[PDB]
Amino acid sequence: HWGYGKHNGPEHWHKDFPIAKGERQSPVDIDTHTAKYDPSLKPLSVSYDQATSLRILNNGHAFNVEFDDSQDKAVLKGGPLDGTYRLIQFHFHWGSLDGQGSEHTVDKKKYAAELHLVHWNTKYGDFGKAVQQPDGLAVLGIFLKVGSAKPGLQKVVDVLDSIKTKGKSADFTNFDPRGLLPESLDYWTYPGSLTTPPLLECVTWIVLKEPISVSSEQVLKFRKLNFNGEGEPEELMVDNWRPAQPLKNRQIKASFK
Ligand SMILES: [Zn+2]
């Protein structure tokens, strides 16, 4: 039912998902004047050498690259996190134009896109159990700006033509998610939610300060995808981002000075 249209987009999600009006919704604007450096925050640790990508899928709202999360092959630890979080999928949100597309903003600035690397806490034993808990998920969010090409993104861009419409998928093995990281892993963190329905308040957000650069050619490939299924009227998969939600009572902490 839900999507990003005038009729079914973020403004309306609360009708079927009333947590959309909740106290810990994502994304948020990150005000660098109030998001204070916290010298107790630890560095992020990613152990991705055994990461095992399986498939890439157009699910009608984005494309997901899915990973084998049956063992500790690709894990996020440290930062604000207690214990071990396994990578299950990554996906992006992006705009129709370069000046919009990110979900998080930084002093109201919107980036061209935002990458989300979705991990779940092995405390809970599978993703479905994890999403029911406040400490269930950790999502690493990485901004994209348009400039030089990102070499590590090219493998993704090169298969998007094979999953144009909703429901299409392709084999996608041997993808290295380290290739999507920026050089600095300085971050902001706060407690929040999934940014699509069901909007569950189960996420420790970790949003990197440093954007990655992608080329105009790369992000243009994103914008050729379709929200629709095969044989339906074309609706380009663009502006699949939720806008900033109220911070309410929450604290955003910065890992860096
Ligand atoms: Zn996302």
Side-chain angles (χ1 to χ4, degrees), residues 2-5 7-257:
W2 64 266
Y4 292 93
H7 61 291
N8 64 351
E11 287 297 359
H12 301 292
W13 292 349
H14 67 278
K15 290 170 188 170
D16 286 351
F17 299 91
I19 202 168
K21 308 168 285 186
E23 297 301 298
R24 304 199 309 274
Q25 292 288 295
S26 292
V28 298
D29 182 56
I30 301 168
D31 175 344
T32 59
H33 292 92
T34 60
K36 296 306 203 184
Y37 170 52
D38 176 356
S40 65
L41 281 171
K42 293 176 180 203
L44 299 171
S45 176
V46 288
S47 184
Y48 284 174
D49 197 61
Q50 284 301 101
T52 298
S53 68
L54 299 169
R55 60 186 289 231
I56 189 173
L57 167 73
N58 177 333
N59 58 23
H61 42 101
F63 64 87
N64 288 4
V65 173
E66 298 187 321
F67 285 80
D68 181 343
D69 60 346
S70 65
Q71 302 168 26
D72 287 356
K73 301 172 187 276
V75 294
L76 175 65
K77 299 175 70 174
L81 306 172
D82 286 333
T84 296
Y85 289 68
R86 289 181 184 164
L87 178 64
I88 181 167
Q89 56 101 335
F90 70 73
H91 61 273
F92 305 77
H93 307 264
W94 61 92
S96 48
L97 299 169
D98 292 354
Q100 65 203 62
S102 68
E103 299 210 302
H104 295 88
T105 57
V106 181
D107 297 321
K108 304 296 179 60
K109 177 194 170 68
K110 293 168 164 98
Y111 291 89
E114 187 174 328
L115 163 62
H116 291 160
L117 298 112
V118 182
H119 308 74
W120 62 269
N121 192 339
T122 65
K123 187 177 165 181
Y124 296 114
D126 56 52
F127 179 82
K129 289 168 181 68
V131 297
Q132 295 295 315
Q133 302 294 345
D135 64 342
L137 298 196
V139 181
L140 182 55
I142 306 179
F143 296 123
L144 281 62
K145 66 177 192 178
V146 175
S148 56
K150 191 67 164 176
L153 181 57
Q154 201 56 45
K155 184 168 160 71
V156 170
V157 157
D158 286 349
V159 299
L160 291 183
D161 276 347
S162 78
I163 57 153
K164 186 192 185 188
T165 52
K166 176 178 177 173
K168 289 205 75 183
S169 69
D171 293 341
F172 196 65
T173 57
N174 298 312
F175 186 76
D176 183 358
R178 290 167 298 185
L180 298 175
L181 298 173
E183 275 303 298
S184 175
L185 275 53
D186 291 342
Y187 66 86
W188 298 277
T189 183
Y190 75 96
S193 80
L194 307 181
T195 71
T196 52
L199 303 169
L200 295 167
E201 291 179 343
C202 64
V203 182
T204 301
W205 277 100
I206 301 166
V207 176
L208 297 189
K209 177 185 212 302
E210 182 175 350
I212 64 172
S213 289
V214 302
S215 68
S216 194
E217 293 83 347
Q218 289 177 320
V219 67
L220 281 172
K221 286 291 283 134
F222 286 18
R223 294 188 186 126
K224 292 192 74 197
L225 290 166
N226 287 5
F227 283 130
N228 52 283
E230 192 167 70
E232 306 168 5
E234 192 170 62
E235 299 178 72
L236 294 168
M237 186 179 279
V238 293
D239 295 315
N240 59 348
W241 53 276
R242 190 189 190 187
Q245 300 299 307
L247 188 60
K248 305 278 200 184
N249 209 1
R250 289 173 295 178
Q251 182 179 21
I252 311 176
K253 303 177 187 163
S255 80
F256 60 90
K257 292 173 198 203

